[PDB]
Structures are given as C-alpha cells and as structure tokens.
Amino acid sequence: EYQNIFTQVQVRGPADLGMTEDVNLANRSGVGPFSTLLGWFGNAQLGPIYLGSLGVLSLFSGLMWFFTIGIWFWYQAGWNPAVFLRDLFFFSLEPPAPEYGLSFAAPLKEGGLWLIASFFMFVAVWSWWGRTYLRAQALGMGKHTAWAFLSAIWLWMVLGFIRPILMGSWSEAVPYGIFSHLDWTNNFSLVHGNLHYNPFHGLSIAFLYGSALLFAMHGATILAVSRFGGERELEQIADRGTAAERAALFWRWTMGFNATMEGIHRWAIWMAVLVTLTGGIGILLSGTVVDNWYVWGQNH
Amino acid sequence: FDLASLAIYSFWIFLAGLIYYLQTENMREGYPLENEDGTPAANQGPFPLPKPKTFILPHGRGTLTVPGPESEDRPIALARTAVSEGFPHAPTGDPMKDGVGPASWVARRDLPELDGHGHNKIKPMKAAAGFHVSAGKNPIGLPVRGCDLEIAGKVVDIWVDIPEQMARFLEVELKDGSTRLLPMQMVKVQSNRVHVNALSSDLFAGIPTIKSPTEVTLLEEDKICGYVAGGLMYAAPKRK
Amino acid sequence: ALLSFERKYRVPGGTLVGGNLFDFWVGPFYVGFFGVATFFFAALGIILIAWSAVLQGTWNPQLISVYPPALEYGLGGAPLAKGGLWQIITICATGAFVSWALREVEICRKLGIGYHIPFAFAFAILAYLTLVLFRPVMMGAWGYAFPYGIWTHLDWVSNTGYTYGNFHYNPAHMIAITFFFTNALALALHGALVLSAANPEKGKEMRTPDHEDTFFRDLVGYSIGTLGIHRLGLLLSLSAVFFSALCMIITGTIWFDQWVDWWQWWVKLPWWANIPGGING
Ligand code: BCL
Ligand code: BCL
Ligand code: BCL
Ligand SMILES: CC[C@H]1c2cc3[nH]c4c(c3C)C(=O)[C@H](C(=O)OC)c4c3nc(cc4[nH]c(cc(n2)[C@@H]1C)c(C(C)=O)c4C)[C@@H](C)[C@@H]3CCC(=O)OC/C=C(\C)CCC[C@H](C)CCC[C@H](C)CCCC(C)C
Ligand SMILES: COC1=C(OC)C(=O)C(C/C=C(\C)CC/C=C(\C)CC/C=C(\C)CC/C=C(\C)CC/C=C(\C)CC/C=C(\C)CCC=C(C)C)=C(C)C1=O
Ligand SMILES: COC(C)(C)C(=O)C/C=C(\C)CC/C=C(\C)CC/C=C(\C)CCCC/C(C)=C/CC[C@H](C)CC/C=C(\C)CCC=C(C)C
Ligand SMILES: CCCCCCCC/C=C\CCCCCCCC(=O)OC[C@H](O)CO
Ligand SMILES: CCCCCCCCCCCC[N+](C)(C)[O-]
Ligand SMILES: CCCCCCCCCCCC[N+](C)(C)[O-]
Ligand SMILES: CCCCCCCCCCCC[N+](C)(C)[O-]
Ligand SMILES: CCCCCCCCCCCC[N+](C)(C)[O-]
Ligand SMILES: CCCCCCCCCCCC[N+](C)(C)[O-]
Ligand SMILES: CCCCCCCCCCCC[N+](C)(C)[O-]
Ligand SMILES: CCCCCCCCCCCC[N+](C)(C)[O-]
Ligand SMILES: CCCCCCCCCCCC[N+](C)(C)[O-]
Ligand SMILES: [Cl-]
Ligand SMILES: [Fe+3]
C-alpha cells in the first residue's frame, strides 16, 4: 500500500511567479533552480523571494550580529584557525558583569561587545517581524503569522531584555555561545529552586509536548485522507468533502469529539504559541517575584 | 496571595475561556447533532452552537455561511440493523455503486477547483503546456493491474495540480476505449506496471466517469476517490 | 447522537477480531474488540492506582505515587506494596496503549483511510516502553524506571539527568530538542497560514492556496507545499520522539560518565589537542 510520504512521480512545469495582489513586484527576485531532492518531499521550486527595506535591514543587521560574535570567537581563539574549530562550541560572548548594572559603559572585552551584538539582533528580529506583517498585508491575508511570531519574540525579549532590566543588570541576560547558553539554562534553574516547580514552566512543557502530539495527529490525519485530496484544506473549508468528514469521524469515534478543517488550525496555532507565551511568563517571574520555585510551590 | 499565584490563577481562567472558544469554533460543521432517524438529538452537549460566520469565496463563487441548515443532498442506501441506537446501518444494495461507507462521497459543488488566477487547478498533462515528468518512473504507457493480478488498462495521461506541480490522478484507458481517473495516492508505480490494490481489474469500469475530458469537478473527485477507497473493504473477496 | 453527515459512514465491517460481535458504538465512541480490551486494562490499572493510594494513606492526586521495585529486586517480581503494583499497572498501561492503537486501526479500515495515525501513536508508545521496559531491563532492574506520580516523576527526570552532569550535553538529547522546537515552530506557522488565507483582511475574498505559496516564497524564498507541510509535521514530531527514546536507551547502558566528556573526542584530537590558547588551552 502506498503511504504518500515521498512523491512517486515528480512533475515539473513553468515556474510559478506567484500571486500579485498589492506586492511591489520591483522587489521580487527571479526564479531560482528546481530541486529534485526537495521534490520527493515537497515542492521543488526555489524562489522567487521578496527583498525590501525591512528584509535588507533585517538581513544586514542579522549578519552584523553574526559577525560581531564571530570576531569575538576569533579573538578568543587567538586568531588561530585550528583553535577556532577545536573550541568553537566553547567560545562565548558574555554580557557585562553585574558591576556595570544596566550601563552601556562596559569595555568591549568586558561586555560592551555583547551589548553591540544584542542591538543588531534586536534590529534584525524586529525588522523581520514587520516583514511577516507586510508580506501578509500585501497579499490581503490575515496577520496570524505576525501574531504567532510575537509569542516567540515575547520569550526572546524576556530572556535578554525585559527580565535583565527588571533585575537591574545586563549580567542576567543569556550569553552568545553553543555550550555557554546551555550552561546558562542549567544555572538559571538551580539558582531559582528548580524550574520543574514553576507552574508556567510545566504549562510550557505541556504545550511543547502537546505541539508534537497535535502535529503528529494532524499530519497523520491529512496524509490518511490525502487519497481524498484532504490536504487542499482551503477548499475543504469552503466546500466540505469526504476527506474532512472521514478525518473528523475518525477522531469522533476514537476520543469522542472532533474538529473542522478550519478549527483544527486554531487548535494548532494556540497549542504552539502557548509554549512561548507561558514560558515567557514563567521566566519573567523568576527572580523578580519568586526566588525559589520549589519553596514557593509548597505553599500553593 | 503573591503576584505569581495571581498570574497562574489568571491563566487557568484564560485557558478555560480559550477551550470553550476553540470547541465552539469546531462546531461549525456537522452540528446540531441528530438522532439516527435524522431528527435533532435532545442532548447537544454543554457547548452552544457558534454564531454564523461568512466566507466570501473568490471568483464570484458566492458566499459560505457556517453554521447553517445542513443537508446531505443525496440518498443514502442504508437501513437500521437495531431498534436501539449505536449499531451499524447495513447497505441495502451495492455499497460501491450507492456510495456508502468507505465508498462514501460528499455532494460537493459540480465545479472544478480553481487556482489563484481563476483557471482549473487540475488539468491533464496533455493540456498543461510545459509540464512533464521530471523524476521517478513515468507511468504513461504502463499497464494497470488490479488486486486480482489482471490488467485493467493502460496509463494514457497524468492529471496535474498545476499550482503545486503535483500528480493527482492517472488517466487509465480501459479495454472498451473509455478512460477513468485513479487517485495517485492509491496506485503503486513500479518498473513495468502500475498496481492498484484497492480494485480488481473488473471494477475499474465502475469508477465514476467525468463529463469533460479536460477537467474534473469537486463532486467528480469525491465520487472517484470514494469509490476507489471503498474497494479496500468491498473488493476484498477477490483480492489475491 | 450523530453528526449531520455521519450516518452514511456507520456501516458494518472493518474489525480485526470478533467480526460483528463488538462492531457498534456507544454515543460517539466506536467500541470494537480492542475498545473492550482498552476498557479492561484501563479499569484494572485505575483500580490498582486507587489501591496503591490506600496503601499510601492519601487520596490527594498530587501526592499519590506508585514506585517501582527497589534496585535490589533486580528484574524479578516484587510484592504489591514494594513495587508489585507498579509492575502490574505498567502491564495494564501497555495493554491499554496498544489496544488503543489497534482500535484506531479498526476505525481506519471502516473509514477506508490510511493507517498513519496509529502508526504515529506507536512512536509515543515506543518512547514509553523505552523508559519502563527497554532501559530498565538493559540496566538490570525495574527500579530504574520512573515512578507513576504527578510530581515524583518530575523528580525522576531531574535525578536521572543530573547523574550524568548536565544532560544537555547528551548529543542525541540535543537532536531531539531541535525537533521539538522546530515542530512547534512549524505547527505555529502552518496554523497561522491556513487561518490567514481562510480569514483574510476585512473587505477581502477568501484567499487561495496560491496565496499561501506566494506568502512563504516572499518571506523566505521557498514554499514546501500543502502536502509537504503535513509530511513535515508528522516527520518533525516523530523524529523528536525517536531521538528522545534514543538519547535514553544509551544512557546508563553504553554511556556511564558525564555527557560533557563525550565531546572531548573532538577537542583532544592529537593535532590541535595540545596547541596553546583557546578555551581548552
Ligand atoms: C516525557 C519525558 C518524561 C516526563 C517529563 C515531564 C516533565 C518535565 C513535565 C511533564 C509534565 C506532565 N507529564 Mg510527564 N514525563 C514522562 C512521562 C509521562 C507519561 C507517560 C505515561 O509516559 C504521562 C501520562 C505523563 C503525564 C504528564 C502530565 C501530568 C503533565 C503534562 C503533559 C502534557 O500535557 O503532555 C502533552 C499531552 C497533552 C497536552 C494531551 C493531554 C495529556 C493529559 C494532560 C495527561 C494527563 C495524565 C494524568 C495526569 C495521569 C494519568 C491519569 C490516569 C487516569 C490514572 N508524563 C517521562 C517520564 N512530564 C509536566 C507537568 O506539569 O508535570 C506536573 C512537566 O513539567
Ligand atoms: C537544567 C535545565 C532546566 C530547565 C531550564 C529552562 C530554562 C532556563 C528555560 C526553559 C524553557 C523551556 N523548557 Mg525547561 N528546563 C528543564 C527541564 C525541561 C524538560 C524536561 C524533560 O525535564 C522539558 C521538556 C523542558 C522544556 C522547556 C520548553 C517548554 C521551554 C522552551 C520553549 C521554547 O520553545 O523555547 C525555544 C524558543 C525560543 C528560545 C524563542 C526564541 C525565538 C527568537 C525570536 C528567534 C531567534 C532568531 C535567530 C536570529 C535565529 C537564527 C536565524 C537563522 C536564519 C535561522 N524543560 C530543567 C529543569 N527551561 C524556557 C521557558 O520558557 O521556561 C519557562 C526557559 O527560558
Ligand atoms: C534536570 C533534567 C534534565 C533532563 C533530563 C532528561 C531525562 C532524564 C529525560 C529527558 C527527556 C527529554 N528531554 Mg531533557 N533534561 C533537561 C532539559 C531539557 C530541556 C531544556 C530546555 O532544558 C528540553 C527542551 C528537554 C527536552 C526533552 C525531550 C527531548 C525528552 C522528553 C520528550 C519525550 O521523550 O517524550 C516521549 C513521550 C512520552 C514518554 C509519552 C508517552 C505517552 C503514552 C504512550 C500514552 C499515555 C496516555 C495517558 C496516560 C492517557 C491519559 C488519558 C486521559 C484521557 C488524559 N530537556 C535537563 C538538563 N530529559 C526524556 C526522554 O528522552 O525520554 C525518552 C527523559 O527521560
Ligand atoms: C509520538 C509523537 C507525539 C504523540 C503522538 C500521538 N499521541 C497519541 C496519538 C498520537 C499520534 C494518538 O492517536 C492517541 C490519541 O488518541 O490521541 C488523541 C495519542 C494519545 N497520546 C496521549 C497522551 C500523551 N502523548 C504524549 C506525547 C506524544 N504523543 C508525542 C510527543 C504525551 C506526553 C507526556 O508528551 C502524553 C501524556 C493520549 C491523550 C492518547 C492515548 C490515549 C490512550 O492510549 O488511552 C488508552 C488508555 C487509557 C484511556 C488510560 C489508561 C490508564 C492506565 C491503565 C493507568 C495509568 C498508567 C500511567 C503510566 C500513569 C502515569 C502518570 C504519571 C506520569 C503522572
Ligand atoms: C483535519 O482533520 C482533523 C480533524 O477533523 C477535521 C480532527 O478532529 C483532529 C482531532 C483534533 C482535535 C479535535 C483537536 C483537539 C485535540 C487535542 C488537543 C489532542 C489532545 C486530546 C485529548 C487530551 C483528549 C483525549 C481523549 C481520550 C483519550 C478519550 C477518553 C477515553 C474514553 C472515554 C474511553 C474510550 C472508550 C471506549 C474504548 C469505548 C467504551 C467501551 C466499553 C466496553 C463500554 C485532527 C488532528 C485533524 O487533523
Ligand atoms: C569565519 O567565521 C566568521 C567570523 C565569518 C563568523 O561569522 C563566525 C560566526 C559564528 C561562529 C557564529 C556563532 C554564533 C552563536 C554561537 C550564537 C549563539 C546564540 C544563542 C545560543 C542564543 C542566545 C540569544 C539570547 C539572547 C541573550 C538574546 C538577546 C536579545 C535581546 C532581546 C536584545 C537585548 C538588547 C540590548 C541589551 C540593547 C540593544 C539595544 C536596544 C534598543 C534594545
Ligand atoms: C529550502 C532552502 C531554501 C531557503 C529556505 C529558507 C528557510 C526556510 C525553509 C523551509 C521552510 C519550510 C516550511 C516551514 C513552515 C511552512 C508552513 C506551511 O504551512 O507551509 C505550507 C506551504 O508552504 C503553504 O502552502
Ligand atoms: C500573542 C499570540 C496571539 C495568537 C494569535 C491568534 C490570532 C487570532 C486573531 C486574528 C487576527 C487576524 N487579523 C484580524 C489581524 O487579520
Ligand atoms: C489548548 C490545549 C490545552 C491543554 C491543557 C493541558 C493542561 C495540562 C496540565 C499541566 C499541569 C500544569 N501545572 C500548572 C500543574 O504545572
Ligand atoms: C482534560 C481531557 C478530557 C478530554 C476528554 C473529553 C471526553 C470526550 C468528549 C465527550 C464524549 C461524551 N459525550 C459528551 C459526547 O457524550
Ligand atoms: C494579574 C495579571 C497576571 C498575569 C495574567 C497572565 C494570563 C494572561 C495570558 C494571556 C494574554 C492574552 N493574549 C495576548 C495571549 O491574548
Ligand atoms: C487574563 C484574561 C482573563 C480571562 C478571560 C479570557 C477568556 C477568553 C479567552 C479569549 C480567547 C479567544 N480569542 C478570540 C482571542 O481567540
Ligand atoms: C485537552 C483539551 C481539550 C478539552 C476537550 C474539550 C472538548 C469536549 C467536547 C465534548 C462535546 C462534543 N459533542 C458531544 C458536542 O460532539
Ligand atoms: C500486554 C502486553 C505487555 C507486555 C510488556 C509489558 C512490560 C511490563 C513490565 C513489568 C514486568 C513485571 N514482571 C511481571 C516481569 O515482573
Ligand atoms: C504498538 C502497536 C502498533 C499499532 C499500530 C500499527 C500501524 C500499522 C497498521 C497496518 C495494518 C495492516 N493491516 C494488514 C492490518 O491492514
Ligand atoms: Cl521586505
Ligand atoms: Fe493542515
């Protein structure tokens, strides 16, 4: 029996230059090459891509953030390429020491460079957010993408900007480094009396687990009804077909209730955004309101 | 009652309202619940029916308001097997021809789905300028074999989802000269043949036909795909 | 009660066991043979949990905890109160989970759909058995399994992880985490995209799937497609759980030291191992 995990026969035609709507066609690149590799799993067409001020700004600002961390790593490596590759995951660009508080006066080697990198990351992420809004807007679509992105930004803002300010020291922010930011995560839990007992942390885990649960359910469901064209979900919303009916009834017969072709995507978007929405709350409260989650938990 | 306790209590209240909202939004199709005789069921659950919403369909195709007066808009050739509720309803005739059970189809609009520009989303490759097979086995010309290991016909064309550049049906020529569409997800393209495990060779003629050689409507797709999937249960007696 | 469109699907057939004996529904739930089995295992397992609560002396669900046998018991049986209840409940939970998956299969057959859903559910089951069966057996005692308690089973995660330093450095653990994060990222984008097309700006007609493709090409220069994203979500979530069971099946069985030491191979390669400078110089 065919399972529809990989395309059996790829087909290719003229590149699809895409819908126009109110998109400024001046900022669209040409079409890229087709990828037979990607064609086995999804679409083979690469490009075009829209490139505006925000995209150029986000892209450039992002590279500067990347390059700032890069030359710090080369400096830590003594400019030796061998040392660079050996200790790559061990390098780290740390925030200013607690002595500097929220001052931007820290020397470059003493956390000033971390501040410069964070500025470029700040510009890159926020200019990229406005990009997810304006691209949907140009096509007349809803802004669900930009709002879902805000949830991820919210946790990122708490970790490196909001909470450090409320704590009164940039030293509370996360360092730029592969292993170093893993070490930061572990120390954060120990300092705050075990995050396992932060209820917003447990909620965040429930939605993270639940996101894998729901996408496995939904991905498997759509593939099981792709023999009825169930992946064409927009037309199934406008004109319910046997795919939407069999998908709903499988779950009704299994667990007693079911979704619609549209409604399941509201379950999905909320299951996912709640991960970082509750997570950011839990982190924001750690150290500002609660110093020991285990001890706090014993009284509630 | 510190700020943390207030936040976690506030969130649980929010999550309850969110679940209530999500569940009602997922009740815009198939509700209200019915008894097995079609009448409204007395117990509809604790969640109320949502208030109507309107989609404005593109290409002047009208507007959809859901929820709204439901209707199958087709006869159902089934009959109760029990006085009490909760038992299967048995086909009264040929379930594959009557389109019941795994062979069910929905009375979708008898129009083809359209792409963003108002053109037919699915077309035969012979009518799709520039489209071709770019990887894998090209099934055109191959014989089509049923679960009885008999040959039912020959692949003569591929119907392509143009916006997605995806094969969705195989057009198969039967021994009588006519053709039928086969869901791409229900065939196995091999080196020398196409094998269809859902149908026996003599059940291909029973696949519903399309009224136009260069397009297929949503209703036609549902009748075709339902019939083929129904063969898994109803064509099994002659499945080697 | 039925959905408005449900009757035509409620036909007989599709069972794997018992023919038409259990081929019926209770309200919305389909029963079938494995629906009866599920109920039997589930009922028995819940009775044993209530029993363990009586022995424990509390009915507060936050405090109830069924512990596995002590390490000294090895892989043999233990008395009900000294770990036997955990053993029997573990049997019942397995019976319930597997029966649930076979019930889903019978529902797939009656509806004539693919078997992707129970196949995906089997990965979660494999992860469960990795923690309560495969890893304890390979290590030589049921006591290495985790206890059945809301909070005690979090303490087991913490105690197990810190036995190997920071479990973050478990390289399979990193891969599994990447799939969990990426999956949630993909789930959020997919749900947002369908909704943004089905619910466009005010004064706009419903969008088409071509708009979905165009939006993502404009954004990152590539669209995986309507079918591809459902393949992707299924793959991200199952791979996440696959590498989870992998990062544990190897912990305490073929790896026993702190997981940070695993990375010393890359560092102390005899060529750049001794070069002065850097973090490791
Ligand atoms: C996965 C790796 C670890 C582990 C690490 C963690 C960590 C770390 C956390 C949890 C958390 C939870 N875990 Mg645990 N957990 C494991 C194995 C399990 C198993 C199991 C049978 O294997 C179960 C049933 C649970 C159950 C639970 C819930 C009590 C809670 C929320 C999970 C959730 O929503 O997931 C996604 C699933 C859904 C959204 C679907 C709905 C699932 C519901 C909520 C399950 C309820 C189970 C019920 C309380 C127990 C059985 C009741 C019977 C009727 C007797 N864990 C193993 C040992 N688990 C979090 C918590 O808050 O704990 C207090 C938390 O922080
Ligand atoms: C010792 C370790 C501690 C612990 C310490 C922490 C800490 C500390 C934190 C978490 C957090 C999380 N933990 Mg914990 N955690 C522990 C144990 C667990 C266990 C477990 C099995 O026991 C589990 C399952 C979890 C699970 C989780 C997640 C639910 C949560 C992260 C959400 C997320 O998606 O972040 C990933 C998403 C983001 C980081 C958002 C970032 C998005 C930004 C905007 C994008 C970056 C753009 C950038 C430029 C990208 C590159 C560009 C390229 C072009 C691609 N923890 C133990 C007790 N955990 C977080 C949380 O919310 O806690 C409440 C957190 O801060
Ligand atoms: C202090 C703790 C340690 C640590 C130690 C461990 C240990 C120890 C383990 C993990 C494991 C995991 N960790 Mg770690 N981990 C830490 C920090 C993290 C961080 C972080 C941000 O810091 C993250 C993101 C993670 C992430 C993860 C995942 C990769 C994984 C859990 C998912 C899983 O296996 O699901 C698998 C899914 C299941 C087990 C669910 C099965 C459900 C069954 C089949 C059905 C249940 C039905 C239910 C009872 C019915 C209820 C019905 C009612 C109607 C509701 N860890 C720190 C460093 N981590 C776990 C793992 O890999 O396990 C394999 C694990 O055991
Ligand atoms: C593999 C990818 C992800 C996934 C997928 C997945 N899960 C699934 C499915 C799929 C595809 C289903 O089809 C199936 C379903 O029907 O979901 C609605 C299911 C399911 N996943 C569930 C839960 C679940 N999945 C999880 C995870 C995941 N599921 C993965 C992340 C998790 C966690 C911890 O992350 C949980 C808690 C259930 C809602 C459901 C399976 C229901 C089932 O099997 O019911 C039969 C059993 C009972 C009704 C009760 C039995 C009770 C026992 C006898 C006693 C209790 C034993 C247990 C050990 C107690 C311990 C509790 C403590 C740890 C607190
Ligand atoms: C596009 O197509 C799709 C649909 O339709 C169009 C859907 O409908 C769904 C289903 C998804 C949802 C409804 C969203 C909500 C689900 C979540 C959050 C998952 C988490 C769910 C839960 C926690 C609920 C779990 C419920 C149970 C395990 C049921 C409890 C068990 C009972 C009552 C026992 C089972 C009964 C029997 C065995 C029969 C009785 C037997 C006897 C002998 C008496 C998906 C994925 C989908 O793609
Ligand atoms: C050949 O190599 C060259 C040199 C070319 C390279 O390019 C090498 C480059 C690398 C090897 C890249 C290495 C990169 C990393 C290891 C990145 C690691 C990052 C993480 C693990 C994630 C940490 C991010 C979390 C934090 C701390 C985010 C901070 C963001 C804040 C929300 C913004 C805070 C803003 C501040 C403090 C002020 C700025 C101004 C404002 C107005 C806000
Ligand atoms: C691929 C190399 C070229 C550059 C790539 C840059 C990075 C992004 C890559 C893949 C995005 C995968 C999709 C992630 C989420 C998609 C959400 C969705 O639903 O998309 C389906 C489809 O695209 C709408 O019809
Ligand atoms: C902070 C995360 C919020 C979750 C996102 C939920 C979006 C639902 C609201 C739709 C808004 C779309 N609109 C009207 C702007 O086009
Ligand atoms: C949108 C889906 C909602 C699912 C809700 C699941 C709730 C899980 C309960 C986890 C327990 C959290 N807490 C506060 C005790 O740590
Ligand atoms: C917190 C998880 C609980 C979710 C399980 C809900 C039970 C299934 C839905 C109701 C089935 C019975 N009903 C109401 C239709 O008669
Ligand atoms: C006294 C205030 C305590 C904090 C409240 C936390 C719960 C609110 C979370 C939902 C935020 C609303 N939103 C933006 C997601 O729609
Ligand atoms: C802090 C909020 C207090 C609780 C009130 C919230 C309950 C309703 C939840 C609204 C979610 C619905 N919506 C439309 C925004 O998606
Ligand atoms: C895990 C969070 C999900 C909670 C489940 C809430 C939905 C239950 C709906 C039951 C009513 C369904 N019914 C009978 C009207 O079809
Ligand atoms: C019904 C299928 C169950 C097969 C796998 C169950 C594993 C249970 C692990 C506990 C074993 C305890 N015992 C009886 C060997 O002492
Ligand atoms: C651990 C239990 C695993 C159950 C899930 C099995 C999924 C595959 C289903 C294929 C069924 C094939 N067959 C011959 C019964 O039709
Ligand atoms: Cl732009
Ligand atoms: Fe979908």
CATH of the domain at B224: 3.90.50.10
Q: Name every residue whose Cβ is closer than 8 Å to that of residue A15 and which is 6 or more positions away in sequence.
A: A31, A34, A45
B27 and B117 fall within a common domain: no
At the fourth CATH level, the homologous superfamily of domain A203-282 is: Photosystem II protein D1-like (1.20.85.10)
Is the bond preceding residue A48 a cis peptide, omega within 30 degrees? Answer: yes
In the CATH scheme, what architecture does the domain A53-191 have? Up-down Bundle (1.20)
Q: Name every residue whose Cβ is closer than 8 Å to that of residue B120 and which is 6 or more positions away in sequence.
A: B112, B113, B114, B215
B80 and B163 fall within a common domain: no
Q: Is A74 in the pocket of ligand 6 (CB under 6 A)?
A: yes
Chain B: closest CA distance from residue A119 (Å)? 31
Judge whether A23 and A139 are in contact, CB under 8 Å.
yes
* Inter-chain residue contact B55 with C5, CB threshold 8 Å: no
Judge whether B113 and A232 are in contact, CB under 8 Å.
yes
Backbone angles phi, psi at B40, to 5 degrees: -65, 140
Q: Which residues of C touch B99 (CB under 8 A)?
A: 8
**Residues A184, A7: Cα–Cα separation, whole Å:** 43
Give domain status of residue B204, yes or no.
yes
Q: Which helix (H) or strand (E) is B230 found in, with range? A: helix B218-234
In three state form, how does the secondary structure of C43-111 look? HHHHHHHHHHHHHHCCCCCCCCCECCCCHHHCCCCCCHHHCHHHHHHHHHHHHHHHHHHHHHHHHHHHH
Residue C26: Cβ-neighbour burial (10 angstroms; 0-12, 13-18, 19+): exposed
Query: Which has the closest alpha carbon to A210: A146, A150, A279, A270?
Result: A270
Is the bond preceding residue B67 a cis peptide, omega within 30 degrees? Answer: yes
Q: Residue B234: which domain range?
A: 101-238
The bridge status of strand B122-124 relative to strand B89-91 is unpaired
Give yes or no on whether A53-191 and A203-282 have one common fold.
yes
Q: Which two tokens stand for residue A21?
A: 């709507």
Helices C116-129 and A199-224: angle between axes, nearest 10 degrees: 140
Around ion ligand 16, residues with a beta carbon closer than 5 Å are: A 52, 54-55, 131
Domain boundary among B28, B57, B91: B91
Determine the 3-state secondary structure of A286 from DSSP.
strand
**Residues B80, A222: Cα–Cα separation, whole Å:** 31
Q: Domain residue spans in chain A? A: 1-51, 53-191, 203-282
B72 and B37 fall within a common domain: yes
Q: Is C97 in the pocket of ligand 3 (CB under 6 A)?
A: yes
Give strand pairing partners of C25.
Answer: C30
**Residues A223, A227: Cα–Cα separation, whole Å:** 8
CA C91–ligand 14 middle distance (angstroms):
5
B118 and B224 fall within a common domain: yes
Q: What share of chain C is helix, strand, coil (3-state, %, to 5)?
A: 65, 5, 35
Q: Which two tokens stand for residue C111?
A: 């509806």
Q: Is C211 annotated as a binding residue?
A: no
B53 and B159 fall within a common domain: no
Q: What's C7's DSSP letter?
A: G
Nearest-CA residue of chain A relative to C196? A142
- Using alpha carbons, list the distances in angstroms from residue A189 to A97, A171, A183, A206, A270: 20, 16, 10, 18, 26
CA C136–ligand 10 middle distance (angstroms):
35
B197 and B119 fall within a common domain: yes
Q: Which two tokens stand for residue B37?
A: 């005789």
CB of C42 within 8 Å of a chain A CB? The answer is no
Domain count, chain B: 2
Method: X-ray
- What is the DSSP code string of B62-96? -EEEES------S---EEES-SSSSS-EEESS-HH
Backbone angles phi, psi at C248, to 5 degrees: -100, -40
* Inter-chain residue contact A145 with C189, CB threshold 8 Å: yes
Q: Name every residue whose Cβ is closer than 8 Å to that of residue C197 and which is 6 or more positions away in sequence.
A: A141, A142, A234, C206, C207, C208, C209, C211, C212
B79 and B147 fall within a common domain: no
Residue A153: Cβ-neighbour burial (10 angstroms; 0-12, 13-18, 19+): middle
Instruction: Give contacts of B 83-142 with C, CB under 8 A.
Output: 86-91, 95, 99-104, 106, 114-117
How remote is the C-alpha of C148 from its chain's centroid? 16
Side-chain-facing half-sphere of A216: CA atoms under 13 Å: 23
Q: Quick one: which atom of ligand 2 is closest to the CA of A283? A: 64
Domain boundary among B63, B91, B119: B91
Question: Buried (b) or exposed (e) across C114-150, using 16+ Cβ within 10 A?
Answer: bbbbbbbbebbbbbbbbbbebbbeebebbbbbbbbbe
CB of C198 within 8 Å of a chain B CB? The answer is yes
Domain boundary among B39, B62, B91: B91
Q: Which two tokens stand for residue C256?
A: 């026993």
If you count them, how many residues does chain B have? Answer: 240
Determine the 3-state secondary structure of A146 from DSSP.
helix
Instruction: Cite the beta strand spans of chain A per DSSP E.
Output: 10-12
**Residues A208, A204: Cα–Cα separation, whole Å:** 6
